[PDB]
Ligand binder design. Sequence first.
Ligand code: CLA
Ligand code: CLA
Ligand code: CLA
Ligand code: CLA
Ligand code: CLA
Ligand code: XAT
Ligand code: LUT
Lengths: 67, 213, 40, 227, 227, 150
Amino acid sequence: AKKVKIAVDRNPVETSFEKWAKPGHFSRTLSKGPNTTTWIWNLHADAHDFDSHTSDLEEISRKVFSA
Amino acid sequence: VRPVWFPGNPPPAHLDGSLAGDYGFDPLFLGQEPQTLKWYVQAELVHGRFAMLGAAGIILTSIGAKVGLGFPEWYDAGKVVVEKNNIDFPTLMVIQFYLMGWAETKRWYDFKNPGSQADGSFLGFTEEFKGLENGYPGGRFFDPMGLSRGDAAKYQEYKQKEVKNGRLAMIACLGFAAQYAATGKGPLDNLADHLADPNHVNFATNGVSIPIA
Amino acid sequence: MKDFTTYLSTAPVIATIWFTFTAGLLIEINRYFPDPLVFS
Amino acid sequence: VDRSKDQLYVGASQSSLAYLDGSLPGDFGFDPLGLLDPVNSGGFIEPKWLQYSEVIHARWAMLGAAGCIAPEVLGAAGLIPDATNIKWFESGVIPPAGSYNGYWADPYTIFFVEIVAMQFAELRRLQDFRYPGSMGQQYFLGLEAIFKGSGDAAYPGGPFFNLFNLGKTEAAMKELKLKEIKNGRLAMLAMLGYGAQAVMTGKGPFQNLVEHLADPVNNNILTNFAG
Amino acid sequence: DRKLWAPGVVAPEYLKGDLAGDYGWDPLGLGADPTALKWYRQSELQHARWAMLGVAGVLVQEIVKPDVYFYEAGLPQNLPEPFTNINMGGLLAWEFILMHWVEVRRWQDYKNFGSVNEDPIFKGNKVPNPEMGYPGGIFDPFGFSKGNLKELQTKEIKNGRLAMIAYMAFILQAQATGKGPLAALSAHLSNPFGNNILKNIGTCTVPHSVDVQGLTIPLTCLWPGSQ
Amino acid sequence: GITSELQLYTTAIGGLVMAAAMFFAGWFHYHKAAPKLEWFQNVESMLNHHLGGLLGLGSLAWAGHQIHVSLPVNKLLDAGVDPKEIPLPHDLLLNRAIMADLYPSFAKGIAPFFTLNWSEYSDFLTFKGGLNPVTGGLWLSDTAHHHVAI
Ligand code: CLA
Ligand code: CLA
Ligand code: CLA
Ligand code: CLA
Ligand code: CLA
Ligand SMILES: CC(/C=C/C=C(C)/C=C/[C@@]12O[C@]1(C)C[C@@H](O)CC2(C)C)=C\C=C\C=C(C)\C=C\C=C(C)\C=C\[C@@]12O[C@]1(C)C[C@@H](O)CC2(C)C
Ligand SMILES: CC1=C[C@H](O)CC(C)(C)[C@H]1/C=C/C(C)=C/C=C/C(C)=C/C=C/C=C(C)/C=C/C=C(C)/C=C/C1=C(C)C[C@H](O)CC1(C)C
């Protein structure tokens, strides 16, 4: 039987403003930048759709917890 | 290896110790970009040199008031000067920005284009406005005694003294404003009161700084 | 710092600052020159 | 928990014995919530910080346990004037519970000295944990020669923190660390006792002991629920 | 192989017995810097030698003039008959001028050893100055230094360190009891149990200030004693 | 039981301190110590803590505030006492005599709770129902017993 215990990863994501200056970084489709105004709306509609940005359940859970 | 503001913490990469008063203190990384740092270095020196003049002027006149030579308090001097001497406040204010505007603008465009003020356009003067380093004009007008034109090692020592005394004066001026707001008295009235009873007359008992007390 | 100042140059942030400034200017003009209906 | 000395205390579990190998002082195998497991540890829940924190609590508690009862005992013996014979919670730490006027300054003047003094003492101690040996490098009026540490944050040692260089041998030092931790854990529980008894009774720790001895059956926690 | 300040301790690597009275005692490591050790050795000699004059002055003066309290001997009204009520400002003028000269002469010797050995007016007069802090020559007219100098230096520092502690005992005893060192000793002998530190430590007999020919001089005890 | 702007002001400051703590926790638990997937999947442990801890202790703690602060203050307010003449909440906490005046059962301390003489607390743990005729709201002694039971 798995023991219930605390388990974390140390320093998984570096704290940096680099991605603040790269709109759409979170998605493979949008990270390349706009060509039409539809990109702008798509940036906001997909911002919190965490599971559409990755398939790793651990990565999704961490985003949910901090959100 | 050099001493830093927070012993044990390595200094940031962009503070390499060449500048005077470099103690690796920039926790918000405000001067990370080299071009921004040059502008901030001059801003610190202009602030420090104005604060040193202000601290010495406030201290001297406060002494005169304390020993009863008739000087006003620094927070009352402005009103006393204009009324006593019949000076139009707006006229004095306009003259100040003419003279400061001329000196500041020339300083501004030497930062943007070093040595540009030494071409002779201003009354034919050339060398006195060339400048030596960022924030250190030098020359016969700004350094008449040529203390920057003698021993190089001595000159570097004076730079360390200037910025450190400048930072201390900036803190002192902040103290004058905070102490006047808290106590309503002059700087040397505060000093005299503290010396009379140090344990019971200090910021912890002024009724303002520690509201919960 | 370069990246942070780049973030402050994005469209929503610039729009926020510019409209805050433009609104402040219009509000302050009406504070000192109240009820303007015509030019005199 | 099993008091006294034992190979393992009551709460010891087969799970805790995987990482509690007895190397650390006071390792009696008691970690039912598994807070010292090294696997996937982080933050402040890690072996080094938790062991460092226990010693720090132990040392402050030992000063507190002796200091919170000393004025009452010496006051009873007449060695100090009755004016300074005061309960630990009426010295001014909790003004609503009572305060002592007679210090050379008001407690807020004294508190500012405490902040500045403790900031220096505490932040320098922190830097030796974060950067071992870093407090022996930068100039500190020549005192940096005694702040080198030893690589173990909880036991800096050196010419001052180990003034008489006790525990010269490994076996001797290991024995002393056990004695420090067991007295520290006893002191930590004593401080908790002082706090609960003050709330329950409103009297000092020494009065509680005197009254319990006078009539143990009629003076105890069970009879202190009522009034 | 010399005896150290405590048993089982290890002398610092920079204390090898070269200096007189070396017990390898430096808990704070202030002498680890070789330049600082030389300066601190000079100040130790100054404290040692001034303290010995202080103890001799207090003891001899108390015997010769028991009616005069050494703690208050500095007030002008208490000065001997020729100097009674002398202008304290004029008196300070002599001391400032004369001490500034001899202290700067001694100071320049530390800065550049052997550079101020010669009389500045009458050329040809010189002091051997074998070691810093030990001028000799005119300062050693009886020629005792022409012998076991190292032993004498040990005796000088040992008696000097004892006198430093002795004098501060006089100061604290004066503040607590208001009596001179010999008067305090007599009081203890008469009533050893009713007159000791256990009762006097809570009292500070020094006023908050005194008036000296129109100038108010603040005074303080060394602890927050009850005025 | 809040009676002064000072009490409101202090709560606002504490809210900002909590707000900063929440934002720190979010940064800390994403960038510094991020839980692993197995941590999230302890649904049994999460329910135990959210039932007994979040809801159970939260209700017990709030019942503690009601018994020691809300009830005494609202009892005096509904009696016409001026808000500034009502004892401050910490005075009620530290002076059992003042509480015993309002609720005599407080003269017996916590002994009735530990001896199972729970009927002693009927003066502040009630089952009135209906509404307080002065304020038009629920009896606060009923809500306090509600939160104890919850
Ligand atoms: C939803 C809330 C939540 C949850 C589920 C967690 C969960 C976790 N946190 Mg996080 N954390 C939170 C909020 C939360 N945190 C907040 C708001 C902060 C900011 C203050 C932090 C700051 C923080 C740090 C700095 C650390 C964690 C750590 C942890 C881990 C171990 C926690 C532990 O040992 O607790 C058991 C509890 C304790 C050891 C004692 C806590 C004592 C507190 C301060 C006082 C009592 C609080 C109580 C609820 C209310 C008292 C009221 C009254 C009586 C005064 C775990 C993954 C640790 C980690 O990453 O481990 C790997 C770690 O280092 N958290
Ligand atoms: C960390 C633990 C701790 C803390 C925070 C306190 C706090 C307090 N204690 Mg307690 N105490 C403690 C431990 C502690 N105690 C212990 C372990 C004991 C047993 C030994 C006692 C025994 C005790 C007694 C008997 C009394 C107190 C009292 C006090 C109060 C006044 C403190 C005071 O006047 O200091 C005064 C300051 C100092 C002692 C430090 C001196 C600082 C100067 C600047 C140093 C100068 C150094 C210089 C080189 C001279 C050296 C000379 C020397 C070589 C001869 C205060 C609430 C008093 C009280 O309750 O009064 C109502 C009181 O009477 N405590
Ligand atoms: C932890 C030690 C401690 C602390 C913090 C205090 C704190 C205080 N004492 Mg107390 N006191 C203590 C121990 C302590 N005392 C002891 C052991 C004795 C017996 C010698 C006394 C005797 C005493 C008296 C008679 C008076 C005070 C008073 C005071 C107040 C300071 C003013 C004063 O006159 O101090 C004087 C006290 C001292 C300088 C004692 C210093 C003790 C040091 C810090 C600890 C180490 C001592 C060491 C073991 C040697 C002891 C003597 C030796 C012969 C055995 C203050 C509340 C005064 C007060 O306000 O009374 C109402 C006061 O009148 N104390
Ligand atoms: C200053 C500290 C800091 C920095 C530099 C970063 C940096 C980063 N974070 Mg981290 N983070 C921080 C604090 C920080 N974080 C905090 C405080 C939290 C807790 C909430 C988190 C939680 C967190 C998560 C969960 C994630 C990141 C991620 C990221 C990356 C992308 C960030 C981005 O695009 O932001 C730009 C985004 C914004 C400016 C939106 C801000 C939203 C906040 C909550 C404020 C909204 C308030 C507003 C009033 C809402 C209503 C609006 C209405 C009035 C119109 C980047 C490496 C993402 C990543 O991909 O990491 C690898 C990611 O998934 N961070
Ligand atoms: C969570 C809810 C809660 C809380 C916090 C309290 C709290 C309190 N109640 Mg209340 N009460 C509650 C729920 C609660 N009650 C409920 C549900 C009921 C209905 C059954 C009652 C019924 C009730 C009655 C009838 C009475 C109280 C009383 C009290 C007070 C004294 C309790 C006592 O004797 O403790 C005994 C001891 C403890 C609780 C242990 C204290 C442990 C301390 C904090 C340890 C500190 C240790 C630490 C190391 C110290 C460091 C010090 C530092 C400076 C160094 C106290 C303010 C009594 C009172 O006087 O009220 C005014 C009282 O008569 N309560
Ligand atoms: C100079 C001195 C006294 C001088 C007294 C004089 C002139 C007195 C003159 C008069 O009295 C007369 C004759 C007659 C009176 O009518 C008038 C006056 C004017 C009053 C005392 C020094 C007294 C000096 C003392 C007590 C110094 C003690 C220092 C100690 C213990 C240091 C210890 C350590 O530093 C080490 C060595 C190593 C580190 O690692 C660890 C620590 C612990 C820090
Ligand atoms: C182990 C384990 C295991 C598993 O895994 C889990 C678990 C179970 C959770 C765990 C457990 C834990 C515990 C039990 C803990 C405890 C603690 C404590 C009690 C502390 C104290 C602690 C305590 C402390 C610090 C204290 C301190 C104190 C002090 C300083 C004091 C001081 C003072 C004095 C002198 C006097 C005056 O007049 C006042 C004052 C100022 C007040």
